[PDB]
């Protein structure tokens, strides 16, 4: 399966009949929200794509500018290396894959996608790392084994995966 | 132009000796942390700077990622649009201009190059305006001055510059 990824076109002439990435949410959010809010300044779209004279859209991901309480960090070391309320960051509203080409690496590649974008964008604007709500743990466990660190408690739903970390990808 | 804005460098080898805004706060936070929160990815840094051997700093600036309270917004149809508590934007940290060159538009033209920066960071990332707590009500005159929007009430000093202005100045 040739699947490309780009920010989500103007036109938006991608065909998303039948898309089910078995979240109901994240399938209504592609369907009714993404274009709109990618329009209005609210997140940017990117979407997995395949080759097909009408491409279709096989998975999607925002990013929005965002900033975290410096107390949700769990080194109290980086925590005194903040010298403010909040962190800055970025965050991934969101990130799903469709059913029928899950299982296969693909959300892991858009993370990959999703890190050199705020890698990008870090070096222009403070951005201390990439913030991310699990939707379940499901999800959880997937970005855990990505890397990403645990925010608050253990049962936190909130992750970081750190600058530090991203640029260390990119050398 | 005489003086020119960049990133600032990475060996930040600029002469700072002498600069003077007239807020000894800015003047303290160029000298011990602009250069060590820019490394440590709370913030990026930009600097107005000469061409001498050593470029002397005659002003600078600083970005960071950040959202508000979408109650902020005097407008409520706009709020509306907002789908969630937080909008995300840019914070303009800190802007200064040493005295010396202040009253030349030098402030104007940091402010140009913030909206420029900021406008490219929005096509990659979704970033609803630039956010600003104006230090003094100085700041805030100059801030309102140049189009920025009222947030809270009228005697708040939080402003704001949608990135749909922005877009139509580029
Ligand atoms: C803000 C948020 O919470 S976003 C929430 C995430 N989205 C959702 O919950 C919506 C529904 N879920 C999904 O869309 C998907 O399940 C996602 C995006 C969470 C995961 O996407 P997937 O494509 O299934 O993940 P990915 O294939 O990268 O996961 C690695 C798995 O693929 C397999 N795999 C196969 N080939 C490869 C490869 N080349 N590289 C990596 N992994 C591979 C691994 O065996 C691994 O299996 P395991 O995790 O069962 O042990
Ligand atoms: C988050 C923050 O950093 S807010 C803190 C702001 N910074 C400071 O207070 C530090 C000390 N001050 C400074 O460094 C400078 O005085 C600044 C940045 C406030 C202003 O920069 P300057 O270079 O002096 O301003 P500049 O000459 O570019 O002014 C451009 C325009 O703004 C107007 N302006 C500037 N200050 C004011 C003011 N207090 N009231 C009304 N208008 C003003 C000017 O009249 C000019 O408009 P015009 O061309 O139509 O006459």
């Known amino acids: 399966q040739q699947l490309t990824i780009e ?3 103007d036109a938006f ?9 078995g979240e ?35 998975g999607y991901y925002t990013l ?7 107390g949700m960090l769990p080194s109290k070391t980086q925590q005194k290396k903040i010298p403010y309320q909040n962190a800055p960051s970025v965050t991934l509203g969101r990130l799903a894959i469709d059913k029928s080409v899950q299982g296969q690496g693909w959300g892991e590649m858009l993370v990959a996608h999703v890190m050199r974008v705020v890698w990008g964008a870090s ?14 743990e499901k999800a959880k466990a997937f970005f855990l084994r990505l890397g990403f660190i645990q925010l608050v408690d253990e049962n936190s739903n909130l992750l970081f995966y750190p600058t530090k970390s991203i640029e260390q990808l990119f050398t």
């Open 64 to 70: 929005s500018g965002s900033c975290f309480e410096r």
């Open 24 to 58: 109901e949410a994240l399938n209504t959010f592609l369907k009714e929200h993404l274009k709109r809010q990618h329009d209005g300044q609210i997140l940017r779209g990117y979407a997995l794509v395949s080759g097909d004279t009408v491409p279709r859209l096989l």
């Open 13 to 21: 002439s991608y065909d998303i009949t039948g898309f089910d990435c």
């Open 7 to 9: 920010m989500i076109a």
């Open 123 to 136: 070096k222009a604007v403070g951005i201390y790392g990439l913030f991310v709500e699990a939707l379940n």
